[PDB]
């Protein structure tokens, strides 16, 4: 039961790309984030 077979319904095509990073996952269990895009 604890399987979580997750199917991706995010995109149809995904190609020609530069970055790819993998780590331990980021995530009543409040979870807070701040995203910001400064100088690249």
């Amino acid at each position, epitope marked *: 039961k604890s399987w979580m077979e997750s*199917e991706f*319904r995010v995109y149809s095509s995904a190609n020609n790309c530069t970055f790819e990073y993998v780590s331990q996952p980021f995530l009543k269990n409040l979870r807070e984030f701040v995203f910001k895009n400064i100088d690249g």
Partner: antibody
Amino acid sequence: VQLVESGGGLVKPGGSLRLSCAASEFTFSSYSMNWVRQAPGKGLEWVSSISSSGSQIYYADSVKGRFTISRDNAKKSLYLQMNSLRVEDTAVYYCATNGGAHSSTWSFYGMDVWGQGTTVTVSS
Amino acid sequence: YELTQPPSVSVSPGQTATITCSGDKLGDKYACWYQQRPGQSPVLVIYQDSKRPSGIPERFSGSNSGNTATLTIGGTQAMDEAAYFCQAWDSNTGVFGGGTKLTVL
């Protein structure tokens, strides 16, 4: 969606065909397609299957190296290249959607939308 | 992998039908069932061994355990006379059952 097939006709053994299964709506994009052939005297056989993206393609043991399933979500069409049509390939073929996006989720669904089948006959 | 279905079974109208499907460790897998009335494209009637698709009356009851998949039809009527294909997926391979024909008198 609403499915219509085409392409089945009279060919001799070893010949070439190219079936089709056209969709009405663009919801076709969200459906993993399956090809199922129905014998003139028996039930159904699974022929092939393709993912919603089209990158997860599988064939039955009796048909690999001969058939080539392909699709076009922008064209809302599903094809099936039909080469080395061989003695027991005479049947009626059904195009059936699964719903599961990838082969890992096919077991969680079933083939729900079938179009009108197309009759394929091989004989000398 | 093969799924074994009896060639045919029959019950009188208004009775309860029971059609079996056998496979190796088949109770660990998801099985779908379809109705093929003669001259007709099949229709899905049971999937995930317990759930019932939209548009199907509740008398189409299916269950799975061990090496047998079973479908139960209480209050069988005339148009339950159809070919019944037990389906299952194993290693990304669509394998269909034999197909049990149900006959109502």
